[PDB]
Ligand binder design. Structure first.
Ligand SMILES: CCCCCCCCCCCCCCCC(=O)O
Ligand SMILES: *C(=O)CCCCCCCCCCCCC
Ligand SMILES: *C(=O)CCCCCCCCCCCCC
Lengths: 116, 288, 267, 68, 267, 37, 68
């Protein structure tokens, strides 16, 4: 959370494993894996996306058979600020692998090329 | 240093035991197939037998031995034309599968699931096509495995052939057929020869087009492609080449036996085509 | 001694019991009783839901009718149970699920009737489509009939409407609806209901798949195929009929990846 | 790190001081770290067919009535 | 030493986690953590369903808004969770059920806001009706609002339409909606959300009843009542508003007497 | 003559341990990325 | 001067008197004096990621507040 110290709020961070309507309302997102984040002196909050998959490995391309599901963030209560305080502010998000994470079948990337 | 070597595939089958006349309430011959069981009889259950020391074995019909052969799964065409051609130099792209041909496919489809290491062997042949006397120097071929997600070549000479990470084989014409092995690479615990399902659940709240997918298809079997090119630059006399790919499943396990394919294959699924549904021929019930 | 017998069985699961007095023993497919997913084979890491008696109990599907013209019937699992009580709810609320089953097919008649039904349980029972212009085109809706199941036909009839294709299966009976000869379906776990001998078939099915757990909504693990190996006959009547009823209990079902409920397009 | 195994000899040459008789062995050494690179050993096992031929819950005794 | 604190808590149930950084410890009602029904106190003999993580997880209800005119809010349990995922399904498929709960009320504001909410959990929270011509007449539909809950009022207003009576509760705030003084509601398990101190209330509720298990569809075991003990204020604004959100997790829920699903008349 | 052959690259990753419900002052989920960790 | 090492076997053939089970080893002999000529052994080590994931001076206890 990068708002001022005077700003408070509760947010809901959600992971919905695939196969149903992707959550567009808190009511649905709240039924999947989720963390309700209370903003405060510990500035940050982590939601773990547990490995939940039919296959033992997923593809590194968009693919329905090995689709992974939906990540979403909602307001749980609302951001509240006192007077003389910015009413808008930013949050930044980060992603990282857990210690049970692995990859295989080395391949070239589409993220670089050399034309002619 | 040196390692030196419970029923094995090459063991002799059971001996026939001598058996004599019988008159009793034991009734091996009568049974009831409604139960779902096959009656486990041997000849001494219904005739008199002599003793026979059996030496035959089932060594050649173990799963490994039934499959221990390279089978052709595709033919890839490539060429190396003059630089003055209106037509582009042909490189080939093949989506890896055992379903473009029928013989290996039918054998694997005696089973629902399998696990194996794959040996691929490549036979390469070439020829001239224009009745010309011009010549060509010995060709080198690049066989590049492009796994799902990696950039597929669009031109015979674009950057993807750099292969920094894809495995490639550079094969020299006229040498022994190329060969590599691959581990069991499935994203499941076994390869599925049959998948009774879809890759997408169509949702009520979504258009039919958005929830649609092919019956029986899944990335369970998307293994990417082989891309093949003649590495040599354009030559004034055009040469065309073919790469035949042979697959041998080695170190193999299989599960859940199935009736074999009895009418002609019709696409990569189990579909059949009108006019091919009559495998049996005419034979009269009381004619030998 | 006490009179216990192959033919007389009682099955009890959850709050439900089946009795039979004309059974022909019962089959445990591939010799494997159903089981929960072992830790050494596990894959989703979230704590699974295991409904136990709420879902592992006998559900009876709509009864069908066997006549001299019947070519056969088919159902898929878990699909045929998708709308069955708490099994159905647990299936649709979770991304993943696995389950074994006890399948009990019921069909009684009289000592003067005759006929024989092959009851086959087929892992990955992929069926052939109705098209000779597109392959693998049967739609999700037509591939998944739910409890009413579908039927076999004696004749392949290609769909020629290319404007709005029917997109359904056209499963020919002597080709087991999949391009292989029906006479060989006995390599699949099966029983035969031969009316002079028995009035039911019982098949206990382990979860079978190339994965420990998978999407039940996308994928059927087992098919049940019932075909008349010998046609129905009775006294000298031209149109006899006798009912066939299916009752199926999930066994050792467990589910992972809980979220909002799946609401599938089924028509 | 050689593996020495025996061959099942079919036709035997007229010899028992070199070929046919005094167990003929063969040698295998794997040259690669990946086991997928290995040749097939063909030293395979058999099993009882019962899970397909007799998948019934109560044991089949063939001399007895199947239905009782 | 490590900095652990009363004010900073994490609650995890099933696939759900709550964090808070301004808690005021948490309450375990009557000192009794929720538990499954012991064999020595058991009563229905059928094997119970225990959904475990499928139903024992945090469900968030629709958020409400606190303003200077708010008189208070109420909900009943299990009623407020009747339509919540697999908890709701297990409740309606079974004649009997029991459950404990973790109730977490959320309401943050700022160091310049003030106000205090009493959050009370009341066993058998019977509320008074709107009629002075008939007693005990509130209808099932009006007594059970589901997740939207109901509200308290500062004024008793008798329903005078005897032709078509409204049949609803008229719960007066200073009489705790039941004829007793609100100042004494603190003998019930409670916490206070006083905005200068804390932004949440957490109440762990054991199943409480004069029976080991009962009809969840007929009977609510607990009521949650939230009333402003000190009104909302902020800087010098005339109409401040701040949201209040309820999140509730069933705990140790078990069910008996499985049958077809209950389909209640709720409107 | 013959030589024959601490976490190695081909070792299995850590097992997932079973864990149940929790209600306490332990707060794994809350953190502060300002620290650089 | 042979190095014998074990393979991590993935797909196992139906065999435990020759392949799949009784640890399958492989053999390496270096033919050159220069170690740059050697093949890669691939017998490699892993390490804890902490020098990148937790480079903080005072130890991180994850159940505790990071800031205290
Ligand atoms: C340079 C050559 C590389 C060769 C790359 C081989 C890639 C993997 C191929 C997997 C073959 C799968 C056969 C079974 C398919 C199935 O599941 O039906
Ligand atoms: C066991 O392997 C020790 C006995 C060594 C016998 C000679 C080895 C023959 C050459 C193998 C070369 C290495 C292959 C990569
Ligand atoms: C260790 O090296 C002694 C065992 C020798 C085994 C056979 C060696 C195989 C041929 C190696 C030739 C020398 C290579 C330059």
């Amino acid at each position: 959370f990068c708002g001022s110290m005077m700003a408070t709020g509760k947010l809901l961070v959600s992971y919905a494993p695939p196969g149903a309507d992707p959550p567009k309302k808190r009511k649905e997102a709240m039924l999947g894996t989720h963390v309700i984040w209370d903003i405060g002196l510990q500035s940050s909050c982590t939601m773990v996306v547990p490995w939940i998959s039919n296959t033992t490995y997923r593809q590194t391309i968009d693919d329905s058979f090995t689709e992974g599901g939906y990540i979403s963030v909602f307001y749980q209560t609302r951001i509240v600020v006192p007077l003389s305080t910015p009413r808008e502010m930013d949050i930044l998000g980060f992603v990282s692998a857990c210690n049970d994470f692995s990859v295989r079948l080395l391949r070239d990337t589409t993220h670089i090329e050399q034309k002619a | 240093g040196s390692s030196s070597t419970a029923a094995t595939s090459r063991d002799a089958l059971p001996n026939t035991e001598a058996s004599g006349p019988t008159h009793s309430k034991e009734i091996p011959a009568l049974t009831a197939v409604e139960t779902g069981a096959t009656n486990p009889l041997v000849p001494s259950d219904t005739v008199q037998t002599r003793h026979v020391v059996q030496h035959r074995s089932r060594s050649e019909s173990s799963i490994e031995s039934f499959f221990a052969r390279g089978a052709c799964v595709t033919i890839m065409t490539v060429d190396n034309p003059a630089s003055t051609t209106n037509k582009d130099k042909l490189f080939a792209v093949w989506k890896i599968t055992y379903k473009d041909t029928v013989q290996l496919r039918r054998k694997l489809e005696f089973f629902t699931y399998s696990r194996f290491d794959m040996e691929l062997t490549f036979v390469v042949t070439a020829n001239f096509t224009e009745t010309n006397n011009g010549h060509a120097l010995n060709q080198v071929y690049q066989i590049m495995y492009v796994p799902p997600g990696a950039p597929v070549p669009e031109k015979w000479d674009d950057y993807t052939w750099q292969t920094s990470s894809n495995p490639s084989i550079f094969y020299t014409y006229g040498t022994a057929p190329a060969r590599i092995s691959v581990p069991y690479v499935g994203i499941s615990n076994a390869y599925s020869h049959f998948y009774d399902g879809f890759s997408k659940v169509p949702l009520k709240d979504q258009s039919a087009a958005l929830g649609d997918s092919l019956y029986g298809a899944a990335s369970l079997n998307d293994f990417g492609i082989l891309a093949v090119r003649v590495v040599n630059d354009h030559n004034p006399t055009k040469v065309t080449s073919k790469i035949r790919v042979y697959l041998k499943p080695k170190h193999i396990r299989v599960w859940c036996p199935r009736p074999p394919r009895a009418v002609a294959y019709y696409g990569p699924g189990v579909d059949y085509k009108d006019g091919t549904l009559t495998p049996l021929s005419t034979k009269d019930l009381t004619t030998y | 001694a006490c009179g216990y017998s192959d033919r007389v069985l009682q099955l009890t699961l959850g709050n439900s019991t089946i009795t039979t007095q004309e059974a022909a023993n019962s089959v445990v497919a591939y010799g494997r009783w159903p089981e929960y997913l072992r830790d050494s084979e596990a894959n989703p890491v979230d704590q699974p839901t295991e409904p136990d008696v709420a879902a592992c109990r006998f559900y009876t599907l709509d009864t069908v009718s066997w006549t001299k013209e019947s070519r056969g019937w088919w159902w898929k699992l878990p699909d045929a149970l998708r709308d069955m009580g708490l099994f159905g709810q647990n299936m649709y609320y979770h991304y993943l699920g696995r389950s074994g089953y006890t399948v009990h097919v019921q069909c009684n008649a009289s000592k003067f009737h005759q006929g024989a039904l092959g009851v086959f349980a087929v892992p990955e029972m992929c069926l052939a489509g109705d098209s000779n212009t597109t392959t693998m085109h049967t739609s999700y809706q037509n591939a998944n009939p739910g409890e009413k199941g579908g039927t076999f036909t004696g004749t392949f009839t290609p769909d020629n409407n290319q404007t709005s294709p029917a997109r359904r299966f056209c499963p020919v009976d002597y080709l087991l609806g999949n391009g292989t000869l029906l006479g060989n379906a006995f390599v699949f776990p099966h029983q035969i209901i031969n009316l002079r001998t028995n009035n039911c078939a019982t098949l206990v099915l382990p979860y079978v798949n190339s994965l420990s757990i998978d999407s039940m909504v996308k994928h059927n693990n087992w098919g049940i195929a019932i075909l008349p190996l010998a046609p129905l006959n009775f006294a000298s009547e031209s149109s006899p009929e006798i009912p066939i009823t299916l009752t199926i209990a999930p066994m050792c079902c467990e589910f992972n990846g809980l979220r909002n409920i799946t609401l599938p397009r089924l028509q | 790190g050689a593996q020495v195994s025996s061959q099942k000899v079919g036709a035997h040459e007229n010899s028992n001081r070199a070929y046919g008789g005094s167990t003929i062995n063969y040698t295998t050494i794997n040259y690669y770290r990946d086991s997928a690179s290995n040749a097939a050993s063909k030293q395979d096992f058999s099993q009882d067919p019962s899970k397909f031929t007799e998948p019934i819950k109560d044991v089949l005794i063939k001399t007895a009535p199947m239905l009782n």
